[PDB]
Amino acid sequence: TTIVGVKFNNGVVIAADTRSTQGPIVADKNCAKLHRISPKIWCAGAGTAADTEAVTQLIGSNIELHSLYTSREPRVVSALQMLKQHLFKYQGHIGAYLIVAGVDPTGSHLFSIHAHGSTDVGYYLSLGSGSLAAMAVLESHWKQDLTKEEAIKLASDAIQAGIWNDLGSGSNVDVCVMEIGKDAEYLRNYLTPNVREEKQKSYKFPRGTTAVLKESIVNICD
């Protein structure tokens, strides 16, 4: 997994790869590692997929109920405190590594939460097995005051650094742009640089090839 966060002049952007694995086998060639906590607070997650998903929803659910109760837009620091306090409560057993971002009544924000519960803050971050490949690109191209387009490029490239160079990462690039004044835009499969080449032959078997022992219809109507 390769996930990144990049702040630009008027917002923040997060990106990720789309490969999921178990050992050396690719489980999902195109899974979504970008999670929506609230309309304008998205979280990118590495670690144990089922955990980032679950923990993301739980806090997402509570932030929605909280939002409704207070009649105020959700804050990213709210997601950050609910998340970290949850992870810390579980002594690190919930394998979630998250980069949470978004905009709210107080500006644009960029954080990262580690499975044990500690949080960081900055203009660019990365987590996952592709962590280092990406950071290498960010430490080489990040500059203060990026434009929305430069940030997406940087973010997108950092993710690519992982796809190619990291065995745990691959497939496509997912991006999500959160600009201070507009609606957040989720760009699923922003980049698809790994389309399989057409197979050399068709393996459509001639009917009757498989030997059957018995047959029957099944009843679905109650």
């Binding site: 620091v77 950050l80 405190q81 970290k84 954080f111 500690s118 949080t119 960081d120 803050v121 900055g122 203009y123 280092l132 490949a133 950071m135 290498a136 690109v137 430490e139 080489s140 990040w142 500059k143 203060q144 650094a161 190619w164 160079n165």
Partner: protein, 233 residues
């Protein structure tokens, strides 16, 4: 079966259109204590080959003596020791590769990762890796330790496939390598600001640069970062 004690970190390198470049910082760590600072981990053997070593320093010092002896020895009864029968990078590698695998096979390894960089007599660029297990391989770019994770992704952007080598100049190449050395200084907790760099060009020969330093580091934004989430001041 030993355990490294005083160690050297990353050794990175790549090859351009006319030769190769290789660099390594001048640190000799002892655990987390950055104990020694005048360590040259770039061993030139002759003037067409540079051997960069990382891992256990005492073993490196030992591989160094082996290299010097390999040179002293090649001269013996060799009227062309400085010509047609001089040491080629490929010989030096194959030798170390041998020594490395024999030592792992005896359960008493030389705790190192090595990259032999140079130019063959026919002009060809030589870049190959070997570590304490005797494992070897080649690629337009090679790095050991941390450099394998951070440096490669960068250098590979310059020379991704073979066809990219002829298109790469020494400036472009030396540049990438120096930038990579900076990135490693940003994230490798066992690195130093000072390093050594070397270029083995089929035309200009061996240019060995010492005492370089990591420059142009971005730190200013560090002031706008307070607290770890909700703190404001």
């Amino acid at each position: 079966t030993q355990q490294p004690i005083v160690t050297g970190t990353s050794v990175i390198s790549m090859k351009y259109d006319n030769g190769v470049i290789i660099a390594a910082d001048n640190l000799g760590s002892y655990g987390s204590l950055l104990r020694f600072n005048g360590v040259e981990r770039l061993i030139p053997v002759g003037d067409n080959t540079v051997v960069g070593i990382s891992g256990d320093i005492s073993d490196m010092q030992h591989i160094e003596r082996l290299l010097k002896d390999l040179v002293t020895e090649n001269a013996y009864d060799n009227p062309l020791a400085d010509a047609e029968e001089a040491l080629e990078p490929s010989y030096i590698f194959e030798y170390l590769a041998t020594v490395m695998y024999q030592r792992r096979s005896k359960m008493n390894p030389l705790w190192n990762a090595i990259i032999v960089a140079g130019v063959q007599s026919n002009g060809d660029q030589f870049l190959r890796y070997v570590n304490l297990l005797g494992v070897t391989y080649s690629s337009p770019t090679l790095a050991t330790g941390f450099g394998a994770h951070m440096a490669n992704p960068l250098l590979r952007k310059v020379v991704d496939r073979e066809s990219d080598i002829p298109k790469t100049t020494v400036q472009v190449a030396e540049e990438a390598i120096v930038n990579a050395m900076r990135v490693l200084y940003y994230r490798d907790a066992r690195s130093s600001r000072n390093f050594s760099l070397a270029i083995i060009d089929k035309n200009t020969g061996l240019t060995f640069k010492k005492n370089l330093q990591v420059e142009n580091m971005k730190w200013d934004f560090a002031k706008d970062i307070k607290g770890y989430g909700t703190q404001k001041i």
